[PDB]
Design a protein around this nucleic acid. Structure first.
Ligand SMILES: [Mn+2]
Ligand SMILES: [Mn+2]
Ligand SMILES: [Mn+2]
Ligand SMILES: [Mn+2]
Ligand SMILES: [Mn+2]
Ligand SMILES: [Mn+2]
Ligand SMILES: [Mn+2]
Ligand SMILES: [Mn+2]
Ligand SMILES: [Mn+2]
Ligand SMILES: [Mn+2]
Ligand SMILES: [Mn+2]
Ligand SMILES: [Mn+2]
Ligand SMILES: [Mn+2]
Ligand SMILES: [Mn+2]
Ligand SMILES: [Mn+2]
Lengths: 98, 100, 104, 79, 98, 86, 96, 109
DNA sequence: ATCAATATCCACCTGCAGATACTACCAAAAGTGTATTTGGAAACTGCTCCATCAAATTAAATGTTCTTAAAGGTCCTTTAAGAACATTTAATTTGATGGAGCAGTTTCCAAATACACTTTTGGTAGTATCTGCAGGTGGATATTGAT
DNA sequence: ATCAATATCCACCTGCAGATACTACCAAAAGTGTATTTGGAAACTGCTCCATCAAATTAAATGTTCTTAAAGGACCTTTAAGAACATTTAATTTGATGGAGCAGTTTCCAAATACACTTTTGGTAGTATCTGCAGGTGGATATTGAT
């Protein structure tokens, strides 16, 4: 019977994902969200596959980048757990809000 | 009159004023407040006309029409302002086109 | 009769047309554009003067000052966003102290 | 549904890529919030371009230009 | 003698200084700083009176904007005392540094 | 004709002045360590804007820096400033 | 059935061949370079556009480009680019 | 013809084209005959620097074909390039590997 | 330190996507060459405002004494989040298949631009009299900190 | 829940700095109206690619169960930063003077556009041939956490 330390797979997954570049959200769900949202601005819109892909590529940049800044926030509070208040603080200071 | 003529510096100052009297007929405006207000018109002029600039270009259009401005406005201004501005913009172009 | 009047606006349709040509935003500039643009700028002028107007009066003053313009803008979600990255000379800030700082 | 389609593990994958080690339970709903806001803002502009060019298809240039004026410029679709 | 508790004059100075709009750095010192720096780009420059004023305005406007963010980072770490790390985090998230 | 050696005018930005700013900024308590840090940032800021301002002055072959020189600087700097022209 | 979609694909390649003649580029990555080239072109021509406007000039010359390049590129990168810019203009007017 | 405006300056990039792009882009009424030359060169230089930096990136990773991820590395390592494109997001370029040192093996190391 | 449990790095191998090679077509682009308009660099200089200086006045900086409640650290308990495996739920992948609509192509005309003479007006300027509010005052009221 | 020292509040007044208001002049602008040109709307149509089947095939999410260490709370000591005042430094204010240099103007050609005519190619289609590396296992060494 084997058990790893709480946090060691985490570090494996960090190094793993930072090494790689594949989009980490599953293509389909994301594709549904785009349509659902786009529906509110104009109904019965068709999407170029490239155009949904552009949108995912960027959504993904955004959140990763934001998690970097969210991270530096939790660390600042002498913590190692990202928490909403960290996200809200990072966004306040970025200008999205205020 | 004149010292070899110093050239004309224009600003929207008189119009900013007329409009001030349309909402607040007993209210002033300092030169410093007017200047600010003047930068606000240029800032927004540019911002809009630049958005309209790019918009024509994206569509291979050599002409900025009321429709280029209209879309520019909806891209630039936030919710309600976009709502009312469009409403006023359409009001004015309408009044002007059938005015002859 | 002027084009401004012809469109029923205080702002200068004539000037706005000219500036559009002087800026080279496009090779051609339709007749509709300066009209809409003057309109929108007039409305925006009106919105902000209205608000500061009232801010002047709240503070018992009849002559609007840059401060009144700040108070107008920063207290209004939409105006504050549009002027999100703009600085109103001599405007100060909204009086705001964080809760956790007040004595208890 | 839908926004829930963005799976708790998928959010974890992004926190990892972004260098986060330990994650609060509440982060997932908060992230779901954040992204929708991000998508609403970009898609609104995307669709405006789509509308203005009288198309019924949101092309990639539309998305590209939306992202450019959002200050979030994107290369590698924009041609 | 009557003594005020720590952080009451402070708060009184907050209200005082938010309520007003004058400039809080002295005209002349600030003006020297401009001239000193402007020297590394050009020897023997001249400065329009209003061109300096333009700079002090943006500066003070900026430094107040930053202190607000800084303050929210201090508060984030359950501090009420701003510290250099707060100014740096805030600028890091703003994307002014790293 | 003089044109004096201006050096380390950065100390002319006093601890009391930096306080009043933090105060309007809504900061109750200031580490003594801030004042130096703040003199850092202001110096970086001013450098950035004047660098740009003066580039414009050079470009117009002027020896005087105009307020429009600082206004455009700040525009392209991302910090638009109203009420000084433009 | 023909409408030209002119890109910088080949000029990128010619230059790739100079810096690295043993090396190729994926289309994914070439596209990025086409985006990069346009982006930068825009920024600089835009910034140059403003300059002439600020100085009430109707002509964008080599000089406007130059200042813009200084305004836009970081110190050291602006340093090299100016040199390469002045080379090209000099060599071009030196020509027959 | 005789000579391409591109070669006249020892530039691979299309001087002739860039000149034309400047006219129809509505940047100013007039465009000087040396303007694009300068510009072409600058674009070449910048294209040269990244290709070069990413050409190297393909070395350290065994490959003869530059993919997106190389470019990302090329940029986010160069302090001066990272800055120039600090507002650009490269498609399929991932991140630079980095872990905050308070997150590592046995306490704050 | 001993040691078994996974994880990683190393070599080596290989099918096919996705680059690349070779022909050929061409409209549109890049040049050349030749008459023709014009932007701004040169020059000159009116005259605007910037550097500077002194002296008086007035405001803010500083350096120092006292203190206390903030930070920061240790040591405690509470429970939230990682690791893991056993299910179920979902997403991808394929293949075939309608047919939305984006993009080409040719009309044609409402509306753009042209260059022309015509009328208005916003700004400059000078000269002159108002007026809204800082800024100083006093006396009255609220706040704070010690009880 | 009282006391006093101190700040904050408004009412009232005075001076001046800026705001407003005559007037009178004018160049560049904004108008009315011609004559020529031309963008891009519209209407069409050809085919690229967006949507959507059901149906095998792969890959991921959700739930659960034991577990550990992180988060946060209570207590305690260190000290660093606020409050306050005596002392001293510096900025600001007024006022007047010398000169750089910005910006207004007349001038006039290297250099721009403008225009036809000549040549070139960079993009596209079609056809095919090639190859760099993903993703596949193989089995030493490497890391991590049970002793
Ligand atoms: Mn370095
Ligand atoms: Mn504590
Ligand atoms: Mn301590
Ligand atoms: Mn807990
Ligand atoms: Mn159809
Ligand atoms: Mn008049
Ligand atoms: Mn008062
Ligand atoms: Mn009193
Ligand atoms: Mn009273
Ligand atoms: Mn046509
Ligand atoms: Mn803790
Ligand atoms: Mn002189
Ligand atoms: Mn060819
Ligand atoms: Mn592999
Ligand atoms: Mn294997």
């Amino acid at each position: 019977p084997h058990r790893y330390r709480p946090g060691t797979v985490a570090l494996r997954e960090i190094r793993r994902y930072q090494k790689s570049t594949e989009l980490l959200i599953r293509k389909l769900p994301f594709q549904r969200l785009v349509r659902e949202i786009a529906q509110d601005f104009k109904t019965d819109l068709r999407f170029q596959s490239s155009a949904v892909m552009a949108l995912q590529e960027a959504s993904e940049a955004y959140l990763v980048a934001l998690f970097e800044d969210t991270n530096l926030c939790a660390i600042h509070a002498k913590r190692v757990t990202i928490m909403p208040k960290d996200i809200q603080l990072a966004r306040r200071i970025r200008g999205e809000r205020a | 009159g004149k010292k070899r003529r110093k050239t004309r510096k224009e600003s929207y100052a008189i119009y900013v004023y007329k409009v001030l009297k349309q909402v607040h007929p007993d209210t002033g405006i300092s030169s410093k407040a007017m200047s600010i207000m003047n930068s606000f018109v240029n800032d927004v002029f540019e911002r809009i006309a630049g958005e309209a600039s790019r918009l024509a270009h994206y569509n291979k259009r050599s002409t900025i029409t009321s429709r280029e401005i209209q879309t520019a406005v909806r891209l630039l201004l936030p919710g309600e302002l976009a709502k009312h501005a469009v409403s006023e913009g359409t009001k004015a172009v309408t009044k002007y086109t059938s005015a002859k | 009769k002027t084009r401004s009047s012809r469109a029923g606006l205080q702002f200068p349709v004539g000037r706005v047309h000219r500036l559009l040509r002087k800026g080279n935003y496009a090779e051609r500039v339709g007749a509709g554009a300066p009209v809409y643009l003057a309109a929108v700028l007039e409305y925006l002028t009106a919105e902000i003067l209205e608000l500061a107007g009232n801010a002047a009066r709240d503070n018992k003053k009849t002559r609007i000052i840059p401060r009144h313009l700040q108070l107008a803008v920063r207290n209004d979600e939409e105006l504050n966003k549009l002027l999100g990255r703009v600085t109103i000379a001599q405007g100060g800030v909204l009086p705001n102290i964080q809760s956790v700082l007040l004595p208890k | 549904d839908n926004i829930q389609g963005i799976t708790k593990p998928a959010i974890r994958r992004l926190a990892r890529r972004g260098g986060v080690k330990r994650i609060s339970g509440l982060i997932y709903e908060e992230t779901r919030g954040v992204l929708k806001v991000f998508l609403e803002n970009v898609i609104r502009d995307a669709v405006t371009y789509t509308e203005h060019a009288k198309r019924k298809t949101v092309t990639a240039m539309d998305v590209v230009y939306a992202l450019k004026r959002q200050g979030r410029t994107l290369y590698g679709f924009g041609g």
